[PDB]
Amino acid sequence: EYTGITYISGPLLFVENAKDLAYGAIVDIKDGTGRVRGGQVIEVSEEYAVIQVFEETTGLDLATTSVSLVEDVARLGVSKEMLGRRFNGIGKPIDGLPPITPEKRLPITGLPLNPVARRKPEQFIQTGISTIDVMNTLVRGQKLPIFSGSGLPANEIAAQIARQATVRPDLSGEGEKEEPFAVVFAAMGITQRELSYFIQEFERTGALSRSVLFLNKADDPTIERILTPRMALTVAEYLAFEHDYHVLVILTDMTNYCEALREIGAAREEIPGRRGYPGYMYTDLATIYERAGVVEGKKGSVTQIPILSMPDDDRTHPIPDLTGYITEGQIQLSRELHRKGIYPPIDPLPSLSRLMNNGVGKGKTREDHKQVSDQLYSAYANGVDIRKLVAIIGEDALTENDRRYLQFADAFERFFINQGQQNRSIEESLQIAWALLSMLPQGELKRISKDHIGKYY
Amino acid sequence: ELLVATARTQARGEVLEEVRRRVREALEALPQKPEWPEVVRKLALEALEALPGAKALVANPEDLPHLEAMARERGVELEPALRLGVRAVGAEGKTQVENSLLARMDRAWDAMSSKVAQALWG
Amino acid sequence: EVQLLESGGGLVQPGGSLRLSCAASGFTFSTYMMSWVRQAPGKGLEWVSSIEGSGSKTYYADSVKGRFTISRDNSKNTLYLQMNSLRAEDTAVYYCAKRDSSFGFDYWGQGTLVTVS
Amino acid sequence: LEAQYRERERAETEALLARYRERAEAEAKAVREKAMARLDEAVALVLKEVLP
């Protein structure tokens, strides 16, 4: 128990008599509040070290300080059976019963997955929202952040994806219902309502005996907002890959993440370099997102669904910045369809998609929405855009042609994008879609083929 | 499935805590078994081989006949009031790396929780 | 019933060597710590040596250190004491403690007499 | 019609739980007894690796 402080302020401490510590090492410590906290040796020094405590200092005298190298690397006990159990960012189960015995004690830092070991997926799922399963096509081993503004809901929409997440039985040409489907959760900062709101929709889901919850609250330390992410994903790696189950991971409150990221950003030595946020931010959002992917030789998968909550509707803001680039195919929510009462309020007009004829829309993914996706785009556009152009050109001025454009706007959006407690299968989507498309005569419907038209007449 | 899982854990706990009970009984009579001189030197060994210089060694005076070899190796032994551990205090300053049995018992589910369980259960 | 049978006693010259054996039955031999205790004629009980269930830990009295080796064969249910560099003060009935629940003497053999002369 | 469907289901979703509770409890006992006769063996394993 090494004594001798030099700097204490926040969850970053410095204490001397050290050089026996390694990068990424579990120590313990003593405080004047008569409690034993944690510490990750994030940085190491000549005769001191930088420690990162797993709790906020609210008391620490300089008479009583301690350091005890527990282990050289830093780890968490992880075992096969831990499904049905709830957890927190510390890593203690919050159930009330003795903590389970590991099989492996895997690092919490994370081991990256080989880009060679993956291969293009092609087995799609029902999200119970039409719009996704047509336009972007949410497949296993793929990310798809759901961008959410501040003053906008984030919770509401998320719940819809959790109780209506389900593989196709052979609508894609196969199922994966033959292997158990399960879900993983981990919240990074939640209040009083968001706590209970999530739990009561998991009883709707009927899953609370086959899910692993790593809930981090805001009454819980602020340092565990960036520990918990990595931590959670290692219990994904263990159960998808090495025990062959298709595990859905759902990460929310990646703005409360970013609060904690900022802290270390400037309070440590390192200087800001991403327009007032850190420059080692990249790595912090790489190590997180890049783990996930269907591996070729494994049956099972980690399907990650990021749910942002980013400050306002800026796009220069750090969060949507890096996140955009990282993910392949994206989904957005706005305030155009949230003034109309349409839950979810997905808007794909500014949104973008990069996988929809890239191993998806072809393959064991149906080709019957292949040309539909391409068509819906330029068709939905004709809509939204001219709603603006009308208020300049005239006040009600629209020509024979443009009249039709705007006619297909109000309609498509209402029917289609209001799902919520309503599930639509691959077939149910396309039928309805084509009947709103009959509002435009042939010549704007060039992109759909001769077959398609009649197909879903 | 949850009422099955929970009940197994409660029983499983009873077995883990019960091995600790048995191991702590051993510890109370550990100086009474004659392997006590072999235990104290290897714990005092690791304390000095590490970072400390061994400017002082602190064990009980009734563990002093069993660590008088190491009185003459490094420093002098003056009490933990345990009779179950050995502090050593470095010359790099305050330092202090303490190898106590209590700590290691306690950490025997904090670093080899797997080993014991496999032998218990499989 | 716990049954313990010492063998290998008798007469040794000073500086000589002897090996005591003790057979065990009536219990699961490998899960128990085992000891040797001796008694000189008309004198008290002196602890000689101890060995863990697995054989991984051994313990010796200061009077016998370097000269005596305790060992066990868990497939044969046999405990051994190898004794080298014998002297007249090692003349005793050697009892086999079989078996120490953790450290104490729960059961005793019938003893084997070693005479060093 | 709802009235006579509900009370059918309810009376099986108690019994089913009840039967599972008797297995649960007994399999709690079945993990105890396997360990408790290989208990001394564990304790030898703990002892050997706390003395360094």
Swiss-Prot record, chain A:
PROSITE patterns, per database record: ATPASE_ALPHA_BETA
One GO MF term attached to the UniProt entry: proton-transporting ATP synthase activity, rotational mechanism
Main function: Produces ATP from ADP in the presence of a proton gradient across the membrane. The V-type beta chain is a regulatory subunit.
UniProt xrefs under PANTHER family: V-TYPE PROTON ATPASE SUBUNIT B
GO terms of biological process kind: proton motive force-driven plasma membrane ATP synthesis
Species whose genome carries this gene: Thermus thermophilus (strain ATCC BAA-163 / DSM 7039 / HB27)
Record keywords, A-Z: ATP synthesis, Hydrogen ion transport, Ion transport, Transport
Gene3D superfamilies for the chain: 3.40.50.12240
Top-level lineage group: Bacteria
Pfam families: ATP-synt_ab, ATP-synt_ab_N, ATP-synt_VA_C
Database matches in CDD domains: ATP-synt_V_A-type_beta_C, ATP-synt_V_A-type_beta_N, V_A-ATPase_B
Family (UniProt): Belongs to the ATPase alpha/beta chains family.
Name of the featured protein: V-type ATP synthase beta chain
UniProtKB/Swiss-Prot annotation, chain B:
Full-length numbering of the shown residues: 65 to 188 of 188
Presence of keyword DNA damage: no
Any GO BP: proton motive force-driven plasma membrane ATP synthesis
Top-level taxon of the source organism: Bacteria
This protein's UniProt keywords: ATP synthesis, Hydrogen ion transport, Ion transport, Transport
Name of this protein: V-type ATP synthase subunit E
Functional description taken from the UniProt entry: Produces ATP from ADP in the presence of a proton gradient across the membrane.
Gene Ontology molecular function, alphabetical: ATP binding; proton-transporting ATP synthase activity, rotational mechanism; proton-transporting ATPase activity, rotational mechanism
GO cellular component, one term: proton-transporting two-sector ATPase complex, catalytic domain
Similarity section: Belongs to the V-ATPase E subunit family.
